Design a protein around this ligand. Structure first.
Ligand SMILES: *[C@H]1O[C@H](CO)[C@@H](O[C@H]2O[C@H](CO)[C@@H](O)[C@H](O)[C@H]2NC(C)=O)[C@H](O)[C@H]1NC(C)=O
Ligand SMILES: *[C@H]1O[C@H](CO)[C@@H](O[C@H]2O[C@H](CO)[C@@H](O)[C@H](O)[C@H]2NC(C)=O)[C@H](O)[C@H]1NC(C)=O
Ligand SMILES: *[C@@H]1O[C@H](CO)[C@@H](O)[C@H](O)[C@H]1NC(C)=O
Ligand SMILES: *[C@@H]1O[C@H](CO)[C@@H](O)[C@H](O)[C@H]1NC(C)=O
Ligand SMILES: [Cu+2]
Ligand SMILES: [Cu+2]
Ligand SMILES: [Mn+2]
Ligand SMILES: [Mn+2]
Lengths: 642, 642
């Protein structure tokens, strides 16, 4: 690797396979790799390195989670000396990220199980057109610690849209270690939604089509403004490293901006990535009570990353980056076009029309070029378009867009007239209930505002009522700034009262004496609607605040715990913060939870129009004055012609 | 005029001048036109004309507000017969929108005023480099009912950035009807902030510049996809009318969408515009207690609209519409490029990657072309970028962006160290305080969902606790929809608890029986921080709820009242709704309040990076299924070459 933070290469995937198979020969052992990823270097070594590469050496260390002969091992490898340096058995609750391989075996089980075959026949369904899927099942109080999953089955006849043609009414529990159906109950017969009008491939659709969209062509006469050197980006006044992890997906690191005025590169973000998802359904019945996915932890965001379709998921001028993931046997898989980088045009950067000076016409309007780093993660029926936008103004804008297919619950109801009771969802088509659920993302934000010693300030806006008749005004508002002293102070529920949430470096001030800082401008907040004692809410307890600030700790990385499938909520962000560390003028980290409550509607069927969300990380007294005061608009070059 | 709702043409302004001048000769009368606009045709006649243009005749009627020999007349002209049909004197509180002309004379007053010339010289300032501005003063309980304003002056020597070089500490009140300084107090001597680093014109700046931004060139092989016929726009599956008022600025009307599936054009929005603004400052001192602008009512949004800079305010492919405003004497003034329309590219419309079918690889990504209708209004130091975004998916997204210059208060303080009391703002530069304040906008949205008979439903999300052990889950959430019966029912504070807010046509159902509806997806809400009894708050009481729904009334149009300068808050949306009319299944209108609490930062100075805000009006069971299921991505055509 060019850089200590670079994603694992093919070659590295292979060395790891070899080294492990050397201690666990496959003829003598059952061996499966559930996670192979970088073991995080120590921050100071990375900080030292960056200033002196040619004279700083960091050994590449890999952390492997493998199930070997039914036991979860944690193995640390030092590829500098090609050797296992640690090998331990995980004895607490929870198992690793499922593998793709195991799920592909598991979904065939029902097709050969005799009782299922009877069930299908009883229903008159063609067995040759059934596709099944594995769903995690989490934990519900029981003492048993086994790798079970529920398998759901769907008809595929004339449509590839299988999630909208569920076979509902049957419980199927499979053990992934035995690879065996261990539980079965045909509970209910429900109609299977028709296949009519569920197709989304243009190749399978017929006229009419519309409305017509006018085409376009474009060109950057000087080519892109970013330079990618290995996994290092150079663009406008920014430099940052693009990373990739099979659990986390995209990882952004080392983001710094050059201050033209101070003539200095200044640190903003050491590292940021989504650390966990949580998609809880709201059907308490046997059909769905257990469906509350933890996508990064149970399925892997990196493993679920798809290949971007050029010109569609990214605009025609985008640059793409391929990564490598691994199979259950540790083989390197190439994921082409996993990440794209592109420049976005046409936004006003700032402007002013001055009409207030007699006999004078002054006007100024300038535009900006922004940088989008995009990746897409599809976990089953769910597509997640993940964007990191960088602006020359110093602003960072992480967003998320949702597309894909509703999880349908089949029913004999064809009209809202017939509903007698709470279906736990909406009728979006004859025989189809779009079940209510939430989508929660938790971002990990290791800000190092101009260095690592930082503090978290909450500035409240408060109304002041003038009592002494010393003004014609009866009231005004003002600000009050409190510094969070401990983790318990930095647990913020957004919406309680107006406040600005700022991360400052208390040790560095502007010429006028203001602390340098960056503020979080959040989207309208979503809050959890499950009770705090419900099992999934305990396991997903990191969603209990919109914002959390913690002392940095190299091992606190996964908000729902290192082992999430079948977890008991014993290792979440909620639990770590009970230590209540000091967070004043230290290396600190911010966590922001973004969420959406989803009430399905007919327009979401059979595939869903993008729904988007976004927050902004805005420089707040970081710069002496407007940082783009001296930035010129891109020029306008006229079209060449035919 | 091609259409009943078109803006007034040049010729119409002239006929109005002539007609008023025949009854009030300017040889004998002091005549000033404060407002000349369209008197709203009746909806029924407009709806009927729509279906039989060629067989329906609507007379152009004009509403004039004129100050004549100091009395305010409300004149209604019928241009069909060319005559005044009504002429009444307004005897209540409040006055018309100020005119440009009167402000230009008021600002010269301090320069000939002995007490002021002395103030200037005591401060050592050069009187030939002073510029002044008129600020409205509202009303604070007093009995007087006069047209007074405060005057504030600024140094302009080496910079055109006058708002950041205030001469602070002097009260100056002028009466606009007598045109003279009626009150004066030199209360305080404060340093005038330096001119160094305040300039924003590239023509006045010097190196260095950066970072460099790479150019672009672009092209639409088949030209734009919108057809603008008069003020009528045809684009993709949309049809709508672009209007313009000297008070309201842009008006969107008659927005219908073609439903390819139903083979029918369906009505969404009869009319929408911003009805009023409210920019309250938070300095209770004499210097500032009265500055709480009502920009549309006091200054005129159309009268403050600037000419758009091509390729800067609008991208190179944009089309421009010119309008006409009027001077104080009624003369038509041409406003070039007051409005631009352009297509936006590169967004994903919807997508799915299917990895769940064994041995099958399915993936679909389609992109959307969106329509942006933009106009910019600058009221003083403020710039407001106002966009109406339409999508083929049926979503409308109105957005507002802010840029322009901070209102500075001068101070002798150069460092935060020196601060010893609340300065009611933040030190953003030596000697310069950016005062706290808010920005509130109130949209008028006359939704006619597939027609006029509509209801308003509030769907709240309820947590349900399982007690009876009938499930492994301890809880889930569900929905409870209530129809608002009366206006008191439709006053909404967003943030108290989750709910979807939808406007439906309870008379038209989808095939599965859902009521067609559009829902409002709001930005994070700001709430008022002034007491409800404070004067500006009473006058601006329409910001007391984030959402209001009212029975349609052709005369309820301006949320802060017909007359806003010096108003006493007796004719605002808050008062009208005291009628508490019924809103179940009738012609209703929604009012949506959008706000920002501005805590200034040094990056806002000397000019401010755009700060944007947005909301979405999303189809909700309006369509049978995803309305863009059969829409194709635009063709990517390759660049020809140099
Ligand atoms: C459903 O199962 C099979 C598989 O889909 C059906 O047959 C496929 O078989 C032929 C050979 O490949 C194709 O050319 C046919 O077009 C296709 N047939 C169908 C049904 O789609 C089979 O006939 C069906 N079985 C039942 C019980 O109807
Ligand atoms: C500041 O006010 C006047 C007006 O600007 C200053 O004089 C100017 O006029 C000169 C002759 O026409 C020009 O050559 C200068 O460039 C121009 N100066 C400026 C600042 O624009 C004058 O110097 C002043 N004098 C005092 C005593 O304050
Ligand atoms: C890392 O381990 C625990 C668990 O995450 C954490 O709370 C602790 O403070 C950290 N320990 C070190 C060595 O920093
Ligand atoms: C319109 O005028 C008043 C003021 O807005 C309103 O309250 C009333 O009910 C309406 N009158 C008519 C004729 O509908
Ligand atoms: Cu969803
Ligand atoms: Cu502001
Ligand atoms: Mn940190
Ligand atoms: Mn209506």
């Amino acid at each position: 690797v060019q850089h200590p933070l670079d994603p694992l290469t093919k070659e590295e995937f292979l060395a790891v396979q070899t080294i492990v198979q050397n201690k666990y020969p496959i003829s003598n052992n059952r061996l499966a790799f559930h996670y192979i990823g970088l073991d995080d270097p120590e921050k100071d070594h990375v900080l030292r390195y960056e200033t002196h590469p040619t004279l700083v050496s960091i050994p590449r260390k890999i952390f492997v989670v493998a199930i070997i002969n039914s036991q979860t091992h944690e193995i640390l490898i030092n590829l500098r000396i090609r050797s296992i340096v640690s090998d331990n058995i995980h004895n607490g609750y929870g198992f690793p990220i499922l593998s793709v391989d195991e799920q592909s075996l598991a979904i065939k089980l029902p097709l050969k199980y005799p009782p299922f075959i009877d069930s299908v026949k009883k229903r008159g369904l063609n067995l040759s057109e059934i596709v099944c899927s594995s769903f995690t099942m989490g934990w519900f109080g029981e003492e048993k610690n086994v790798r079970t999953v529920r398998l759901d089955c769907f008809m595929k006849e004339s449509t590839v849209n299988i999630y909208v043609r569920p076979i509902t009414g049957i419980t199927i529990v499979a053990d992934l270690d035995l690879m065996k159906i261990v539980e079965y109950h045909d509970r209910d017969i429900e109609a299977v939604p028709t296949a009519e009008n569920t197709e989304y491939q243009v190749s399978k659709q017929s006229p009419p089509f519309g409305p017509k969209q006018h085409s376009l062509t474009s060109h950057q006469p000087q080519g892109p403004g970013f330079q990618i050197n290995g996994h290092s980006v150079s663009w406008a006044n920014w430099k940052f490293h693009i990373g990739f992890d099979v659990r986390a997906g995209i990882v952004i690191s080392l983001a710094s901006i050059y201050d033209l005025e101070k003539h200095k590169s200044r640190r903003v973000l050491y590292k940021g990535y989504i650390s966990e998802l949580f998609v809880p359904y709201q059907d308490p019945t046997e059909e769905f009570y257990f469906k509350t996915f933890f996508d990064s932890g149970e399925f892997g965001f990196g493993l679920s990353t798809v290949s971007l379709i050029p010109n569609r998921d990214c605009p025609p001028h985008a640059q793409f980056i391929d990564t490598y993931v691994h199979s259950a046997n540790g083989t390197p898989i190439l994921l082409k076009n996993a990440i794209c980088v592109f420049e976005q045009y046409g936004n006003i950067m700032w402007r002013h029309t001055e009409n207030g000076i007699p006999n004078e016409s002054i006007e100024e309007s300038r535009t900006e070029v922004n940088l989008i780093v995009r990746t897409i993660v599809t976990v089953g029926n769910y597509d997640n378009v993940i964007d990191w936008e960088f602006k020359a103004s110093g602003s960072i804008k992480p967003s998320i867009a949702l597309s894909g297919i509703l999880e349908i619950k089949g029913t004999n109801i064809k009209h809202k007239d017939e509903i007698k009771e709470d279906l736990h969802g909406k009728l979006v088509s004859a025989n189809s209930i779009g079940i209510y659920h939430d989508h929660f993302y938790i971002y990990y934000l290791d800000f190092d505002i101009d260095g690592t010693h930082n503090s978290f300030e909450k500035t409240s806006l408060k109304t002041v009522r003038i009592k002494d008749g010393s003004s014609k005004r009866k009231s005004y508002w003002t600000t009050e700034t409190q510094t969070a002293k401990t983790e318990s102070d930095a647990k913020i529920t957004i919406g309680l009262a107006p406040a600005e949430l700022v991360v400052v470096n208390p040790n560095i001030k502007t010429a006028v004496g203001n602390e340098v800082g960056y503020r979080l401008i959040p989207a309208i907040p979503a809050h959890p609607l499950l009770t705090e004692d419900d099992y999934p809410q305990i396991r997903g307890a990191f969603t209990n605040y919109n914002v959390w600030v913690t002392a940095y700790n190299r091992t606190e990385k996964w908000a729902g715990g290192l082992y999430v499938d079948h977890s008991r909520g014993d290792d979440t962000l909620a639990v770590w913060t009970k230590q209540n560390r000091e967070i004043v003028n230290k290396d600190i980290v911010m966590w922001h939870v973004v969420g959406i409550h989803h009430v399905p509607a007919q327009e979401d069927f059979p595939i869903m129009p993008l729904l988007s969300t976004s927050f902004e990380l805005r420089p707040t007294n970081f710069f002496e004055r407007n940082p783009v005061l001296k930035t010129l608009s891109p020029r306008d070059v006229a079209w060449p012609g035919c």
